[PDB]
Design a protein around this ligand. Structure first.
Ligand SMILES: [Mg+2]
Ligand SMILES: [Mg+2]
Ligand SMILES: [Mg+2]
Ligand SMILES: [Mg+2]
Ligand SMILES: [Mg+2]
Ligand SMILES: [Mg+2]
Ligand SMILES: [Mg+2]
Ligand SMILES: [Mg+2]
Ligand SMILES: [Mg+2]
Ligand SMILES: [Mg+2]
Ligand SMILES: [Mg+2]
Ligand SMILES: [Mg+2]
Lengths: 141, 206, 58, 145, 67, 143, 70, 58, 62
RNA sequence: UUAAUUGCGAUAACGAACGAGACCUUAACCUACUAAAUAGGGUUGCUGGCACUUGCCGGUUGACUCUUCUUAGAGGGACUAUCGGUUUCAAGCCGAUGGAAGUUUGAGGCAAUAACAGGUCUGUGAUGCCCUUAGACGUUCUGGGCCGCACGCGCGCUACACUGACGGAGCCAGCGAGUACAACCUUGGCCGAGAGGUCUGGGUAAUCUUGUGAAACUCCGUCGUGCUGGGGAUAGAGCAUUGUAAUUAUUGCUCUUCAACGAGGAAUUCCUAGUAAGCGCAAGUCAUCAGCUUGCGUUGAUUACGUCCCUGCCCUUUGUACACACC
RNA sequence: AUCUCUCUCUAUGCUCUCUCUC
């Protein structure tokens, strides 16, 4: 069997997992194409890495992303991240270091996570307030 | 332009030179004309973001707020008042609609129009409650660029909000109209008027 | 195991909460092994605190 | 979807079941103006009649209106069971009724009178002018009469 | 905010005094040395100590230092 | 080269399926079509009189195709939403429990949805074929 | 709006002759320039879009973005 | 017990607490300090700490 | 009338409420002038600052 | 200087001790290690469907192989690192690079001395003392009552609509919690139009409920400036459910009833990033009931990065006819 | 020799008290 690389994508709590193989030109979210994802507006967010790198760099690829958690936007972001990460992983494994560098450069003209996983995770909701930082409502008299 | 052969179905537009030139969801992020001298890294432009929806850190440094795409900032500003806190997708959609409206009416690249509006609304001279004992004394203070830009954006959004409060006019159309008014032509938009009034007030005071 | 409790025993005072928690560790092992000797083995060595439970099935 | 422009055939503002029915409200929502008639049930009535809901208030021909009225006043015959109508089971006949326009209020009044006669708690409350259905008058109901 | 404790500083000083042979500029080697030589209960503290030792060394290789 | 259900857009597909169902004779409708609100967590019944239950059936079929072990309860949970309690904050209330069951029964009668000996309902081979056909039709409509 | 929810023949004619020259066509626009006010405006717009007359820009509902043929 | 592991553990803790309380109440002159509960599947062992051992014994 | 001057150095921050910056403005049209100006909001070095006011200047804000 | 009696340093003080910090707890990073039908893959069987020449999407406890995601355990990781300048060039700080991350990395949890005449004997078998002690203030049973209403405040919720509402149809979460010496969380299949019944099984736990298919959102509609399909209070009438017991609607569900309410005076609270707000959910209470709290998680802004003007606080000096200490 | 330069009303308040053993 042909070697294939596994990658993931994280945002908030949403977990994407991409599987990059050698093949014809697959790009799949769960069991569907990237031409769907969900919100129609945010279809470009998941499509963006492909646009950046060049669609020809996919003429020998197979991509499948299993996504669980988050909401919708977060999920999309995670998928995008996974795809970017998948590509970079593939380059690391099969292609060349200069190519990897180029890819990184292309990504880092934005750096919307892509190659680097996001920090910024939910802060615990404290007592004496409805929010994490938000205090209750001081009554006085 | 240059179809890439895949097993998965990809639209024609994507296949075309959108891979080659990375400008917006089918709009020109070029042109690049700021009417005032410099003003760059305060009004962002340059970086050709596809859709005005980026999750990043733009409060964690002093001026890093500038590196937000102007469209994105507009969307964020629109995202306001109870019924719409969060729901950035909606805001993005509205912005897209606004852009479309701009394209339809008086042609041009809408981004440039937006930029013009931002420039020509925002105030040079502003008022602060300095006090003089806490009383009604306000020295005329000139405004910093980034802050001014932000203020202009806010007032633009405010105008749209005002328009929409019980009306047939959907937010986006109204916003577009007011933006156009702000840019040049009539200057009968709310935001611009407000700004001018503020400027006048500043002038009559020191 | 979280037990959220107001620290105040009377209620008069500010709203102070304490979540008294007990983290409980499971950890299991699967043995594909013989009979009497295995049983003998899976009985000895006891540390204070930890509870060992051996089930059945042949 | 209708491409039909329509000439001078529809007459706005109609006098149906004594209470005035206003113009260009969407049939169901035109009928809602009448007391006893309410949204979902109006819609159901319309469906039973077999008139398309996506029409004007003045649009309705007389026959259709008549049919609707019949459906409203005599509900049981046109497949409308219990979880449906106003006075289910009822206290006076045993049969259930979908009371309308100037009937429901009368019924309510009658009920109140009966309560007063038989000095029940609810009745007493009504007589007073006080809140009945489990409310604390420490804050509730400071608008008065 | 990063102004460090007294104890950490004292430890660093002691290390400088007693182990100027050994310890250079390489933070990771220095860390290891600290772990070996000084008996500290926590990793963060050790790291801090190492950092301060490095700083002190840097100061030294620019002229004699007070204290 | 071909088509499957997952790779074709949601709403369009569903509407196509509904249309197909309408065209077809067999459906076994209840005696209470558009008399129920489809959810007890809903305020007003569906619009445009004819159909809608067809649409729901189609959606159910799609869901079944997607998963493996889906019962009535799960389907009910899937549908409905927030019930306007009015003055009180809206809790999530499931759909009308019997309607989904009826839909499933109808599907069974048609021969598209069967049962698995684990619990719940799964897709039949004929059903799968039908779904594929619908997908193909949708694709044709698109391009 | 003082009623004005009628697909009147004269009104239709007016719409036909006033939707050109103006670049932007919407329900809101129609309401503004005094013809139809509300729900039936949408219907009118839909039935103007069968073949030609006004070209679509919008791929989205609720808000309509339409430009007349040049 | 047959009850859930977590619940069982909680119960054991409670029992321990109870035991401690009892010892504090009863063994005043006996000079009580602390208790430990060791559980083997057949035998339950409690180790009591004290200063006047003879008294504790009887 | 329109004028604009680049900022170069900040002369601290003054105000009863605070926030309002005292800046040293240098004119890009003739660099011979470095004036003490009142600026409201976030401002660094090397920024083009439009001025509706031509000549009037104040230091402390009270 | 620093968030800091945090440092550096000047030094009738020197050496200290609390406190802070460190420390724990988690949240982030570990394609590193140990590992895994109670966590997911991978290939291939076994089949199902459409292309058919390989294929795509699945189902199935078939093997076998691992472990990136899910779990944990040992560990590692950042220490302000690297420069750039500024500062008696010491202490440090702001900017840039690299980094999962440079605000003490975010948030906690423990919190010193000294008190307050703060709070509670209505947590207790923690009690001093006074009282009542047999028609008892003990005790339990029956029934009310704390839920009464001309009013006045305090929390919170729902709204005042188009970014709406109302229909469809997309579809995605994390904390939990749940059976024995009782009557739990409840799936799946038939009843009913809802609620909720009902025979069955699974699950006294990563397995089953539950992927908690959660909302808000997303797309196609319908309605369209109207106290109007916005608002759902108040009223009727009826069907269930919990309970020995629902009237003073327990709650739930169906119905009809459609008021005040056009963004809110003077006032004032809360908040500087996964934060504010929107939106749910679970848990606590619980037989039944959440508008409540307590914890999660979706959606995710705007504007500061500062000053002491108001409100406090900290130390230093100063003046006090004040120590019940400016009340 | 380098300061620079800010600003006004605001009245009153009645409820104790405490040591040890060297
Ligand atoms: Mg340096
Ligand atoms: Mg801390
Ligand atoms: Mg007592
Ligand atoms: Mg007595
Ligand atoms: Mg009470
Ligand atoms: Mg409170
Ligand atoms: Mg409603
Ligand atoms: Mg609402
Ligand atoms: Mg989950
Ligand atoms: Mg109404
Ligand atoms: Mg109660
Ligand atoms: Mg005084």
């Amino acid at each position: 069997t042909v070697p294939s690389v596994q990658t993931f994508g994280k945002k908030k709590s949403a977990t994407a997992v991409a599987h990059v193989k050698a093949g014809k030109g697959l790009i799949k979210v769960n069991g569907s194409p990237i031409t769907l994802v969900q919100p129609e507006i945010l279809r470009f967010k998941v499509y963006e890495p492909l646009l950046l790198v060049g669609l020809d760099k996919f003429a020998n690829i197979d991509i499948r992303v299993k996504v669980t958690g988050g909401g919708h936007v977060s999920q999309v972001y995670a998928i995008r991240q996974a795809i970017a990460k998948g590509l970079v992983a593939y380059h690391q494994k099969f292609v060349d270091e200069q190519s990897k560098n180029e890819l990184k450069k292309a990504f880092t003209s934005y750096d919307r996570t892509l190659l680097i996983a996001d920090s910024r995770r939910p802060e615990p909701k404290k007592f004496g307030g409805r929010g994490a930082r938000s205090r209750f409502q001081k009554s006085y008299r | 332009f240059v179809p890439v052969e895949l097993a998965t179905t990809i639209p024609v537009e994507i296949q075309q030179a959108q891979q080659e030139i990375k400008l917006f969801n089918k709009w020109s992020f070029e042109d690049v004309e700021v009417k005032d001298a410099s003003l760059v890294d305060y009004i962002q432009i340059s970086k050709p973001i596809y859709v005005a929806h980026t999750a990043g850190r733009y409060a964690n440094k002093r001026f890093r707020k500038a590196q937000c795409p102007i469209v994105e900032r507009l969307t964020n500003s629109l995202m306001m008042n109870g019924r719409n806190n969060g729901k950035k997708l909606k805001a993005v959609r509205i912005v897209k609609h606004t852009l479309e409206i701009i394209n339809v009416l008086t042609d041009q690249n809408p981004l440039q129009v937006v930029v013009d509006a931002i420039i020509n609304s925002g105030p040079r001279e502003d008022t602060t409650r300095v006090g003089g004992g806490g009383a009604a004394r306000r020295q005329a203070v000139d405004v910093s660029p980034l802050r001014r830009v932000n203020q202009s954006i806010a007032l633009l959004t405010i105008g749209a909000r005002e328009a929409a409060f019980r009306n047939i006019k959907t937010i986006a159309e109204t916003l577009a109209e007011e933006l156009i008014n702000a840019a040049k032509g009539s200057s009968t938009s709310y935001a611009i008027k407000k700004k001018d009034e503020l400027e006048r007030v500043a002038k009559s005071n020191r | 195991l979280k037990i959220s409790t107001r620290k105040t025993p009377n209620g008069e005072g500010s709203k102070t909460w304490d979540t008294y928690e007990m983290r409980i560790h499971k950890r299991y092992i699967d043995l594909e092994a013989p009979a009497h000797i295995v049983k003998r083995i899976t009985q000895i060595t006891i540390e204070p605190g930890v509870d060992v439970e051996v089930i059945i099935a042949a | 979807s209708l491409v039909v422009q329509e000439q001078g055939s529809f007459q706005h503002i109609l006098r149906l079941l004594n209470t005035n029915v206003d113009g260009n409200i969407n049939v169901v929502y035109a009928l809602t103006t009448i007391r006893g008639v309410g949204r979902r049930y109006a819609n159901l009535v319309c469906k039973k009649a077999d008139v398309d809901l996506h029409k004007r208030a003045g649009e309705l021909t007389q026959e259709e209106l008549e049919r609707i009225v019949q459906i409203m006043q005599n509900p049981t015959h046109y497949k409308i069971p219990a979880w449906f109508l106003n006075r289910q089971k009822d206290v006076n006949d045993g049969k259930d009724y979908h009371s309308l326009a100037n009937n429901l209020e009368s019924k309510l009044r009658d009920d109140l009178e009966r309560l007063k006669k038989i000095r029940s708690h609810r009745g007493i409350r009504h007589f007073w002018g006080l809140r009945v259905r489990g409310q604390h008058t420490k804050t509730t109901g400071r608008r008065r009469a | 905010g990063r102004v460090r404790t007294k104890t950490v500083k004292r430890a660093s000083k002691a290390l400088i005094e007693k182990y100027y042979p050994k310890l250079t500029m390489d933070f990771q080697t220095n860390k290891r040395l600290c772990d070996e030589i000084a008996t500290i209960q926590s990793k963060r503290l050790r790291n801090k100590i190492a950092g301060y030792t490095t700083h002190l060394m840097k100061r030294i290789q620019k002229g004699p230092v007070r204290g | 080269p071909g088509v499957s259900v997952r790779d074709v857009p949601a709403q369009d597909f569903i509407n196509n399926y509904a249309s197909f169902l309408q065209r077809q004779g067999k459906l076994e409708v209840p005696g209470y079509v558009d008399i129920v609100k489809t959810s007890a967590g809903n305020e007003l019944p569906p619009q445009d009189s004819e159909g809608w239950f067809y649409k729901r059936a189609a959606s159910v079929a799609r869901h079944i195709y997607l998963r493996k072990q889906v019962g009535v309860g799960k389907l009910n949970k899937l549908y409905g939403g927030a019930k306007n309690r009015g003055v009180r904050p809206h809790k999530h209330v499931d759909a009308s429990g019997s309607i989904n069951r009826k839909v499933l029964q109808s599907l069974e009668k048609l021969g598209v949805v069967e049962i698995s000996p684990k619990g719940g309902r799964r897709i039949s081979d004929n059903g799968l074929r039908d779904l594929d056909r619908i997908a193909a039709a949708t694709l044709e409509d698109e391009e | 709006a003082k009623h004005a929810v009628v697909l009147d023949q004269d009104k239709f004619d007016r719409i036909m002759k006033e939707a050109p020259t103006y670049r932007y066509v919407s329900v809101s626009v129609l309401v503004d320039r005094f013809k139809l006010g509300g729900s039936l405006a949408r219907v009118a717009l839909r039935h103007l879009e069968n073949e030609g007359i006004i070209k679509p820009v919008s791929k989205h509902s609720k808000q309509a973005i339409y430009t007349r043929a040049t | 017990a047959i009850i859930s592991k977590k619940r069982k553990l909680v119960a054991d803790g409670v029992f321990y607490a109870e035991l401690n309380e009892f010892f504090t109440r009863e063994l005043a002159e006996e000079g009580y300090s602390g208790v430990e509960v060791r559980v083997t599947p057949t035998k339950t062992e409690i180790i009591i700490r004290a200063t006047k051992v003879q008294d504790v014994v009887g | 009338p329109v004028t604009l001057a680049k900022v170069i150095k900040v002369l601290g921050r003054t105000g009863s409420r605070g926030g309002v910056t005292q800046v040293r403005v240098e004119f890009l049209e003739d660099t011979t002038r470095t004036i003490v100006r009142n600026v409201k909001g976030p401002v660094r070095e090397g920024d083009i600052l439009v001025l509706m006011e031509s000549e009037r200047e104040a230091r402390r804000l009270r």
